[PDB]
């Protein structure tokens, strides 16, 4: 009869993201004439650590092509850039690490990251630390571009959206074991209040469909369909196949 923990997550009362010490949203520059009919050069001031994120944030200063003012943007620092390196943003920019340019111009097999789903989405895909997307196809007519995302999915996107070249800095971040609960607590304290993660079979039937019984067992098939109501989707959600995997999943 009581709302479960996974159901209380959507209320946003105490489960809000700790966004106090966040430096800024990681987004690219706005598409304009100086970007679609040439390129502009900017200077990287410094890279900083964003709490709750493994990818560093590089501050880049560009010169406004219309007003006398310097524009500061926060990009995702690709691995292999240093303070003082000139970063070029535009259509006819040279293919180098750090420079952003539309995917319709780069050749096949280009390892890029921080791209956009739609032209103007301003850097939404492949933003985690050490991830990249691989361009595999091109279409001159009916402009489309096939990319392979870090999840292995091959998605077709527009040929006008941009992507910075290179892999995100901070790779291999998951190779280190947390090695104790204190480091996990300090990690999740900057992200959000979701760490304790009490098992469902430990509590009572009032707070979870799995709790109860004199023996700490589930009693019901953990595989639950997609049509289950709120507060009922627990355990595996529409598990098409369970158990230890045998090779590659190869699912589209």
């Amino acid at each position: 009869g009581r709302v479960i923990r996974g159901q209380r997550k959507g209320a946003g009362s105490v489960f809000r993201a700790h966004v106090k010490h966040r430096k800024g949203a990681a987004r690219l520059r706005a598409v304009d004439f100086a970007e679609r009919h040439g390129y502009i050069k900017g200077i990287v001031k410094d890279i900083i650590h964003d709490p709750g994120r493994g990818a560093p944030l590089a501050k880049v200063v560009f010169r406004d092509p219309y007003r006398f003012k310097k524009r500061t943007e926060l990009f995702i620092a690709a691995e292999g850039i240093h303070t003082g390196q000139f970063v070029y943003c535009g259509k006819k920019a040279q293919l180098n690490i750090g420079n952003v340019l539309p995917v319709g111009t780069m050749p096949e097999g280009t390892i890029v990251c921080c791209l956009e789903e739609k032209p103007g989405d301003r850097g939404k895909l492949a933003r985690a630390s050490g991830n990249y997307a691989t361009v595999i196809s091109h279409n001159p007519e009916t402009k489309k571009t096939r990319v392979k995302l870090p999840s292995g999915s091959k998605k077709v996107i527009s040929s006008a959206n941009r992507a910075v070249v290179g892999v995100v800095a901070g790779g291999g971040r998951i190779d280190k074991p947390i090695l104790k609960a204190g480091r996990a607590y300090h990690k999740y304290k900057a992200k959000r209040n979701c760490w304790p993660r009490v098992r469902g079979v430990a509590m009572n039937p009032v707070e979870h469909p799995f709790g109860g019984g004199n023996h700490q067992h589930i009693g019901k098939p953990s595989t639950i369909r997609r049509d289950a109501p709120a507060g009922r989707k627990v355990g595996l959600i529409a598990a098409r196949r369970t158990g230890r995997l045998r090779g590659t999943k190869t699912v589209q």
Partner: protein
């Protein structure tokens, strides 16, 4: 003269900043501007019924001005001179002791109701209509009624311009009923050109369908496609 040199500024991609341009095509207009602007584009895109296509097709700048100069002689009598003539009437009546010392002056009739009650009884020699009316339904029925009654009807541009003669802000229609003996010929000379333009072509106007015009950005692309296809066929 010794040192008067030129400083050519390069306004390209990244040499110098861009100067101040018109930017009228990209300025963010208010909501009441954006609503009243795209209404014309909608009227041009949608296939308007043949009952609206009667309007937006009016007299040229010559015959309309001629009709206005003709109507300027039979304008409705203003309130100032109305009070003047009503004050003079009671005086000259006691002076001369006459029944009707002033002949009824021929004047045009204003108002859609008056125009309709005149054309239904066949009392109007001519009808002139405005097209800047916002609710078109108050006017769509009039051209068919004049076609059925056989009277000459003509549409003109500007309800305010139609309006100024009647001394009011907005006037929909005006009916000519009585014309002087010396302007009868000038009126009959133009009713013929009005009949051959509107009355005799009523079937073609009713069968004509306007609108259905795409934007230039959508016409240029289809022109490119048809050119590339013609260059492939031959």
């Amino acid at each position: 003269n010794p040192l008067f040199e030129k400083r050519p500024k390069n306004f390209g991609i990244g040499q110098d900043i861009q100067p101040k341009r018109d930017l009228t095509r990209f300025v963010k207009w208010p909501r009441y501007i954006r609503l009243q602007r795209q209404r014309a584009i909608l009227y041009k895109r949608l296939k308007v019924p043949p009952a609206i296509n009667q309007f937006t097709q009016a007299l040229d700048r010559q015959t309309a001005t001629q009709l206005l100069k003709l109507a300027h002689k039979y304008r409705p009598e203003t309130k100032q001179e109305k009070k003047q003539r009503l004050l003079a009437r009671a005086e000259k009546k006691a002076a001369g002791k006459g029944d009707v010392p002033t002949k009824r002056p021929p004047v045009l009739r204003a108002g859609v109701n008056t125009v309709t009650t005149l054309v239904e009884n066949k009392k109007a020699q001519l009808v002139v209509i405005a097209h800047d009316v916002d609710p078109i339904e108050l006017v769509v029925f009039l051209p068919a009624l004049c076609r059925k009654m056989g009277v000459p009807y003509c549409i003109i541009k500007g309800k305010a311009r139609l309006g100024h003669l009647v001394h009011r802000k907005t006037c929909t229609t005006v009916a000519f009923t009585q014309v002087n003996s010396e302007d009868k010929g000038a009126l009959a000379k133009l009713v013929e050109a009005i009949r051959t333009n509107y009355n005799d072509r009523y079937d073609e106007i009713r069968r004509h369908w306007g609108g259905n015009v795409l934007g230039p950005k959508s016409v240029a692309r289809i022109a490119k496609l048809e050119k590339a296809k013609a260059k492939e066929l031959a």
